[PDB]
Amino acid sequence: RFLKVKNWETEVVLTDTLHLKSTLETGCTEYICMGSIMHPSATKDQLFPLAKEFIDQYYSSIKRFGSKAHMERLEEVNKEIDTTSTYQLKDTELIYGAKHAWRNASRCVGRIQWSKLQVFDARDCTTAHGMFNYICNHVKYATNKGNLRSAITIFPQRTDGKHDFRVWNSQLIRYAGYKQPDGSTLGDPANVQFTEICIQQGWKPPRGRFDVLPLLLQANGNDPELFQIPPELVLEVPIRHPKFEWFKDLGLKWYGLPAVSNMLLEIGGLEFSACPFSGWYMGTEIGVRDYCDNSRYNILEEVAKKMNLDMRKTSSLWKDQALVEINIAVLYSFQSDKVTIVDHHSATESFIKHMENEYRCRGGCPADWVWIVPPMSGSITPVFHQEMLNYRLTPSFEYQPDPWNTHVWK
Amino acid sequence: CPRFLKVKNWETEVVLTDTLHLKSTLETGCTEYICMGSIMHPSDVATKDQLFPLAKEFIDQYYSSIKRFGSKAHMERLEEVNKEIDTTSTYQLKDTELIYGAKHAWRNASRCVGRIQWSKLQVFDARDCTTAHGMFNYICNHVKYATNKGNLRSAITIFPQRTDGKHDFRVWNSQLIRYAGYKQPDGSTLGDPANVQFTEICIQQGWKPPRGRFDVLPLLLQANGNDPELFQIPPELVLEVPIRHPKFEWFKDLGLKWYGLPAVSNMLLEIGGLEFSACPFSGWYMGTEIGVRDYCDNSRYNILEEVAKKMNLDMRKTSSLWKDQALVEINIAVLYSFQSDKVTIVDHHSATESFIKHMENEYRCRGGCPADWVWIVPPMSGSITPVFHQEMLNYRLTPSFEYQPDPWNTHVWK
Ligand code: HEM
Ligand code: HEM
Ligand SMILES: CNCC#Cc1cc(F)c(F)c(CCc2cc(C)cc(N)n2)c1
Ligand SMILES: CNCC#Cc1cc(F)c(F)c(CCc2cc(C)cc(N)n2)c1
Ligand SMILES: C[C@H](O)[C@H](O)[C@H]1CNc2nc(N)[nH]c(=O)c2N1
Ligand SMILES: C[C@H](O)[C@H](O)[C@H]1CNc2nc(N)[nH]c(=O)c2N1
Ligand SMILES: [Zn+2]
């Protein structure tokens, strides 16, 4: 059928036809919705229909469906799956598939940018040293002295599952986390385990609060190897506040480049298990989640202290007050350092505009309300009032198992 | 469907196991290929063949609840219901079953963060009501009991079930207490813009509007499928709270107030296939319902700008977060004014913490707890509340509260 989505603030109705093209499952059924579940539950035979479908939509997108180039490309892929059990994408197809995996990422509020993506082909890579070189060039290009630029680097596809390329870091730039003897945690508590894997592999930790983790890089299914990203490539921002001059004394910083490195890029049945991709931050990612999650840096108490807020009852809303000031500081600091950052009002604003674009030109836009709505001030942003349909289009970004639970060590 | 489904809390790592979903009875709107979990409203009476298994399902569940499943009272009740449907094509609930069904409709309400209270619900049986004047008496008694001078008590008043669909009891009000909205010729709106359509109906029905910013609407009550009739709620029964701020002495100069009793009156209560089309129920407020939605939605009272101006905030850039700063202070004022006047209210931190504890107990004792994350997470400060990090499963258990068409869209005027 045709499905309608209403904005309850604007009363704008959009009509979704694009959902007719999905085939992956969402995890819901007619009787149970799993919309808030974070991770809901090849061969030559499985591969050609998937390859065919992707080649078909590629040649439909450059408006040459059924052309001679389309016909030969289909046969070319057929012979290649036959005689090698896989196939290799053309450069144009690799670029098209990467942009469309971003376009289809239902959890990303930043997709108005989807077609401006720099795609680095790293499929000639064979070693962890080559991976490091490719990743350093990615970081340097995408950082661009603070004028951040979207980028993805694509390493060789999975073959037999035994020669996977993997970036073991979940993101290219993170801070370490250390278990203290007295039971508390120094640095980033979310990274205590990965940090401990780096230490076990020979990393000499400085045991500070903001230690950039080394890259841990696995090429062709071999043991991963450690590398230190050159510090001049890692842009960082000291967090200060435009009105509270004591805020700089908290000693807070963050890195400028958000770069997801633990996901799987699927294009036409091919699986790119190592595809680090990066954009720029929405302020709440740092200011709400990284700093104020109870399992993360957990600074609300300290800020509420220096703000002298009444902290004896929840109904004083002291946490909400300190939350807003922290997120003012983050935005103010990146902006003062001319480092690209978007606030959640602008980003959600852009996303509503992007949805309108997509419904008009494409017939819909898959979107995960649970992830799109920012983690603070939800209903004063326009996406809170926007109904969204969620569905899985391919090419896509997918989760995959953490490598340390799979890898057969040597 | 699989027998066990697991939900994780990503902040605490607690994993819970759900088996109650195997009892889900109706459709969510999702499919295997599309999820409709953010659609507000996804998707003539019941025949004898439809009614038999729906009643048995409910009667079994009631007798299971009192540890008399399979007993002689259970089999005799099954038989009496079945004979009553056969001869009259409907049946009547016992007082005990009515109370049980209403409490469990709340218990099953996936969008309600307040369900830790579900078993403490005063049920007013109003199935003997025949006229709109009597509906008015019943609703007044409900409002006075539930308000309780500010020490609010949850309550539901249940009016006669649907018969042929042409004799429905309906409260035309969507909530028992709401403020009027008036469209001006110049396009601006006075009062509550959400209620302009309903206010116009009341004016047409004969209501004389005071044309103020906080005018309590009259009740528009439909008995037995007749044309609805207007009644004014006695103002001494409508408890209200002037909104002042503990620090900002100028906040009281804004002239804001709100009513104490949230009372939903447009929903349908389904118990064992019976349809109670008029079942007003009330609890107490979570502060953000007033402080965030009623006051700061753009299409509502929309005070963020004016509070920001008095706060002397940089309003040129969105990235100063002036909107977020003002929103917090408005919600501080709402909670502070309700507490100072000793009117029951709950902040979004206490409510979500309570709901996590409730959800955990339901998983342990009942095998699950259906919950709609999109509705459970508060509209401000989402991730600093525990429900944000809590995976939830959503499904439709019966007894339930359901939406129904607005009655001015279906009523056949006499
Ligand atoms: C350019 C500016 C961008 C902005 C402002 C932005 C914003 C966001 C935010 C706030 C999230 C939620 C992140 C979280 O809570 O962990 C997200 C998720 C995501 N983004 Fe974007 N993003 C951008 C660029 C990109 C790019 C370049 C890609 C890929 C080519 C991408 C793909 C994704 C994916 C797959 C997710 C979901 C990740 C997951 O499921 O864990 N985004 N984005
Ligand atoms: C006693 C304290 C209660 C609290 C703190 C509470 C809290 C809430 C809140 C904050 C919402 C979201 C409302 C919205 O955003 O429009 C809600 C929804 C709901 N509540 Fe509760 N509630 C309470 C009592 C009750 C009672 C007594 C019932 C029924 C007997 C009930 C049934 C529901 C239902 C059905 C909804 C969904 C309404 C809809 O879909 O429009 N609640 N509740
Ligand atoms: C359940 N969440 C797990 C997580 C996470 C996580 C941790 C990080 F360090 C990090 F940089 C990110 C970035 C997410 C992201 C990606 C992109 C491309 C842009 C953006 N603006 N944001 C995500
Ligand atoms: C866009 N949704 C339509 C709506 C609405 C709406 C309007 C109101 F005036 C109002 F009081 C409520 C109360 C909801 C509610 C109910 C109960 C029992 C307790 C509580 N704490 N809250 C809901
Ligand atoms: C589109 C979206 O579902 C809609 O705005 C919802 C979001 N969550 C909500 N949550 C509550 N409690 N109440 C609401 O009215 C809404 N509105
Ligand atoms: C349980 C729930 O699915 C989980 O907490 C989600 C909620 N929404 C989110 N939204 C974003 N953007 N990022 C997240 O990590 C999460 N976490
Ligand atoms: Zn769903």
PDB file of N, CA, C and O in Angstrom, chain B residues 190-222:
ATOM      1  N   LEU B 190      -6.226  33.069  21.055  1.00  0.00           N
ATOM      2  CA  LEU B 190      -6.288  33.339  22.484  1.00  0.00           C
ATOM      3  C   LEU B 190      -6.590  32.040  23.221  1.00  0.00           C
ATOM      4  O   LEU B 190      -7.399  31.233  22.758  1.00  0.00           O
ATOM      5  N   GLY B 191      -5.926  31.831  24.354  1.00  0.00           N
ATOM      6  CA  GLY B 191      -6.100  30.596  25.093  1.00  0.00           C
ATOM      7  C   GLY B 191      -5.291  29.447  24.528  1.00  0.00           C
ATOM      8  O   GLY B 191      -4.131  29.623  24.160  1.00  0.00           O
ATOM      9  N   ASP B 192      -5.888  28.266  24.440  1.00  0.00           N
ATOM     10  CA  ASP B 192      -5.138  27.075  24.066  1.00  0.00           C
ATOM     11  C   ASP B 192      -5.418  26.727  22.612  1.00  0.00           C
ATOM     12  O   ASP B 192      -6.512  26.231  22.309  1.00  0.00           O
ATOM     13  N   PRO B 193      -4.458  26.906  21.697  1.00  0.00           N
ATOM     14  CA  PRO B 193      -4.759  26.686  20.274  1.00  0.00           C
ATOM     15  C   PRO B 193      -5.180  25.271  19.941  1.00  0.00           C
ATOM     16  O   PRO B 193      -5.928  25.076  18.974  1.00  0.00           O
ATOM     17  N   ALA B 194      -4.749  24.280  20.720  1.00  0.00           N
ATOM     18  CA  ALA B 194      -5.180  22.907  20.481  1.00  0.00           C
ATOM     19  C   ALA B 194      -6.701  22.754  20.516  1.00  0.00           C
ATOM     20  O   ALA B 194      -7.248  21.869  19.849  1.00  0.00           O
ATOM     21  N   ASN B 195      -7.406  23.598  21.267  1.00  0.00           N
ATOM     22  CA  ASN B 195      -8.815  23.355  21.554  1.00  0.00           C
ATOM     23  C   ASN B 195      -9.764  24.261  20.784  1.00  0.00           C
ATOM     24  O   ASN B 195     -10.938  24.361  21.154  1.00  0.00           O
ATOM     25  N   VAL B 196      -9.296  24.892  19.704  1.00  0.00           N
ATOM     26  CA  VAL B 196     -10.127  25.851  18.980  1.00  0.00           C
ATOM     27  C   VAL B 196     -11.328  25.166  18.345  1.00  0.00           C
ATOM     28  O   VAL B 196     -12.436  25.718  18.339  1.00  0.00           O
ATOM     29  N   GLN B 197     -11.135  23.968  17.780  1.00  0.00           N
ATOM     30  CA  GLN B 197     -12.257  23.277  17.147  1.00  0.00           C
ATOM     31  C   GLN B 197     -13.311  22.890  18.177  1.00  0.00           C
ATOM     32  O   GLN B 197     -14.512  23.080  17.950  1.00  0.00           O
ATOM     33  N   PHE B 198     -12.884  22.349  19.313  1.00  0.00           N
ATOM     34  CA  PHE B 198     -13.857  21.908  20.301  1.00  0.00           C
ATOM     35  C   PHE B 198     -14.564  23.101  20.936  1.00  0.00           C
ATOM     36  O   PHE B 198     -15.774  23.060  21.159  1.00  0.00           O
ATOM     37  N   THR B 199     -13.818  24.173  21.208  1.00  0.00           N
ATOM     38  CA  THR B 199     -14.412  25.406  21.702  1.00  0.00           C
ATOM     39  C   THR B 199     -15.505  25.907  20.766  1.00  0.00           C
ATOM     40  O   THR B 199     -16.578  26.325  21.219  1.00  0.00           O
ATOM     41  N   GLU B 200     -15.262  25.841  19.453  1.00  0.00           N
ATOM     42  CA  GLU B 200     -16.269  26.294  18.498  1.00  0.00           C
ATOM     43  C   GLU B 200     -17.532  25.446  18.584  1.00  0.00           C
ATOM     44  O   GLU B 200     -18.645  25.974  18.501  1.00  0.00           O
ATOM     45  N   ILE B 201     -17.380  24.128  18.745  1.00  0.00           N
ATOM     46  CA  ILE B 201     -18.547  23.265  18.922  1.00  0.00           C
ATOM     47  C   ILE B 201     -19.357  23.716  20.131  1.00  0.00           C
ATOM     48  O   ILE B 201     -20.581  23.867  20.058  1.00  0.00           O
ATOM     49  N   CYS B 202     -18.678  23.942  21.262  1.00  0.00           N
ATOM     50  CA  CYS B 202     -19.377  24.332  22.484  1.00  0.00           C
ATOM     51  C   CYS B 202     -20.110  25.650  22.308  1.00  0.00           C
ATOM     52  O   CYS B 202     -21.237  25.811  22.798  1.00  0.00           O
ATOM     53  N   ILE B 203     -19.478  26.613  21.633  1.00  0.00           N
ATOM     54  CA  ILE B 203     -20.132  27.896  21.393  1.00  0.00           C
ATOM     55  C   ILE B 203     -21.381  27.690  20.549  1.00  0.00           C
ATOM     56  O   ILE B 203     -22.449  28.232  20.852  1.00  0.00           O
ATOM     57  N   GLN B 204     -21.278  26.862  19.505  1.00  0.00           N
ATOM     58  CA  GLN B 204     -22.450  26.535  18.701  1.00  0.00           C
ATOM     59  C   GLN B 204     -23.544  25.882  19.540  1.00  0.00           C
ATOM     60  O   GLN B 204     -24.731  26.144  19.336  1.00  0.00           O
ATOM     61  N   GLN B 205     -23.166  25.012  20.480  1.00  0.00           N
ATOM     62  CA  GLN B 205     -24.145  24.326  21.312  1.00  0.00           C
ATOM     63  C   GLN B 205     -24.778  25.239  22.354  1.00  0.00           C
ATOM     64  O   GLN B 205     -25.657  24.784  23.088  1.00  0.00           O
ATOM     65  N   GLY B 206     -24.378  26.511  22.425  1.00  0.00           N
ATOM     66  CA  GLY B 206     -24.969  27.474  23.334  1.00  0.00           C
ATOM     67  C   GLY B 206     -24.052  28.013  24.413  1.00  0.00           C
ATOM     68  O   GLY B 206     -24.482  28.876  25.186  1.00  0.00           O
ATOM     69  N   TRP B 207     -22.809  27.551  24.504  1.00  0.00           N
ATOM     70  CA  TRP B 207     -21.920  28.052  25.543  1.00  0.00           C
ATOM     71  C   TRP B 207     -21.574  29.512  25.290  1.00  0.00           C
ATOM     72  O   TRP B 207     -21.302  29.904  24.157  1.00  0.00           O
ATOM     73  N   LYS B 208     -21.622  30.326  26.350  1.00  0.00           N
ATOM     74  CA  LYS B 208     -21.239  31.727  26.256  1.00  0.00           C
ATOM     75  C   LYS B 208     -19.775  31.829  26.644  1.00  0.00           C
ATOM     76  O   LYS B 208     -19.444  31.623  27.820  1.00  0.00           O
ATOM     77  N   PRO B 209     -18.873  32.129  25.716  1.00  0.00           N
ATOM     78  CA  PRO B 209     -17.446  32.077  26.021  1.00  0.00           C
ATOM     79  C   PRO B 209     -16.984  33.335  26.733  1.00  0.00           C
ATOM     80  O   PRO B 209     -17.252  34.453  26.276  1.00  0.00           O
ATOM     81  N   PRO B 210     -16.287  33.197  27.864  1.00  0.00           N
ATOM     82  CA  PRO B 210     -15.666  34.377  28.487  1.00  0.00           C
ATOM     83  C   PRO B 210     -14.561  34.993  27.647  1.00  0.00           C
ATOM     84  O   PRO B 210     -14.184  36.140  27.903  1.00  0.00           O
ATOM     85  N   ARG B 211     -14.024  34.267  26.672  1.00  0.00           N
ATOM     86  CA  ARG B 211     -12.938  34.744  25.812  1.00  0.00           C
ATOM     87  C   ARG B 211     -11.756  35.248  26.647  1.00  0.00           C
ATOM     88  O   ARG B 211     -11.353  36.407  26.584  1.00  0.00           O
ATOM     89  N   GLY B 212     -11.220  34.336  27.461  1.00  0.00           N
ATOM     90  CA  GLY B 212     -10.005  34.564  28.210  1.00  0.00           C
ATOM     91  C   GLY B 212      -8.919  33.562  27.835  1.00  0.00           C
ATOM     92  O   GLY B 212      -9.088  32.722  26.945  1.00  0.00           O
ATOM     93  N   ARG B 213      -7.795  33.663  28.549  1.00  0.00           N
ATOM     94  CA  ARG B 213      -6.634  32.839  28.225  1.00  0.00           C
ATOM     95  C   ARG B 213      -6.715  31.454  28.852  1.00  0.00           C
ATOM     96  O   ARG B 213      -6.113  30.500  28.336  1.00  0.00           O
ATOM     97  N   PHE B 214      -7.442  31.330  29.974  1.00  0.00           N
ATOM     98  CA  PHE B 214      -7.555  30.090  30.735  1.00  0.00           C
ATOM     99  C   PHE B 214      -9.020  29.927  31.162  1.00  0.00           C
ATOM    100  O   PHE B 214      -9.369  29.997  32.341  1.00  0.00           O
ATOM    101  N   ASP B 215      -9.895  29.711  30.179  1.00  0.00           N
ATOM    102  CA  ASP B 215     -11.312  29.461  30.412  1.00  0.00           C
ATOM    103  C   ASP B 215     -11.549  27.954  30.408  1.00  0.00           C
ATOM    104  O   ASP B 215     -11.379  27.296  29.376  1.00  0.00           O
ATOM    105  N   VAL B 216     -11.945  27.409  31.560  1.00  0.00           N
ATOM    106  CA  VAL B 216     -12.291  25.993  31.638  1.00  0.00           C
ATOM    107  C   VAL B 216     -13.492  25.717  30.741  1.00  0.00           C
ATOM    108  O   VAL B 216     -14.547  26.358  30.860  1.00  0.00           O
ATOM    109  N   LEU B 217     -13.339  24.760  29.839  1.00  0.00           N
ATOM    110  CA  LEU B 217     -14.413  24.418  28.926  1.00  0.00           C
ATOM    111  C   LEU B 217     -15.550  23.715  29.666  1.00  0.00           C
ATOM    112  O   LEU B 217     -15.327  23.043  30.677  1.00  0.00           O
ATOM    113  N   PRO B 218     -16.776  23.831  29.166  1.00  0.00           N
ATOM    114  CA  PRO B 218     -17.872  23.036  29.722  1.00  0.00           C
ATOM    115  C   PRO B 218     -17.770  21.596  29.254  1.00  0.00           C
ATOM    116  O   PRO B 218     -17.049  21.265  28.304  1.00  0.00           O
ATOM    117  N   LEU B 219     -18.469  20.728  29.982  1.00  0.00           N
ATOM    118  CA  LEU B 219     -18.601  19.342  29.576  1.00  0.00           C
ATOM    119  C   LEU B 219     -19.681  19.238  28.514  1.00  0.00           C
ATOM    120  O   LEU B 219     -20.676  19.963  28.551  1.00  0.00           O
ATOM    121  N   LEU B 220     -19.463  18.362  27.540  1.00  0.00           N
ATOM    122  CA  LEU B 220     -20.420  18.134  26.457  1.00  0.00           C
ATOM    123  C   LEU B 220     -20.691  16.640  26.479  1.00  0.00           C
ATOM    124  O   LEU B 220     -19.842  15.849  26.053  1.00  0.00           O
ATOM    125  N   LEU B 221     -21.850  16.257  27.008  1.00  0.00           N
ATOM    126  CA  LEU B 221     -22.093  14.885  27.438  1.00  0.00           C
ATOM    127  C   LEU B 221     -23.225  14.274  26.632  1.00  0.00           C
ATOM    128  O   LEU B 221     -24.304  14.868  26.500  1.00  0.00           O
ATOM    129  N   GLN B 222     -22.971  13.081  26.116  1.00  0.00           N
ATOM    130  CA  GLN B 222     -23.885  12.350  25.256  1.00  0.00           C
ATOM    131  C   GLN B 222     -24.291  11.071  25.972  1.00  0.00           C
ATOM    132  O   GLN B 222     -23.448  10.202  26.234  1.00  0.00           O
TER     133      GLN B 222
END
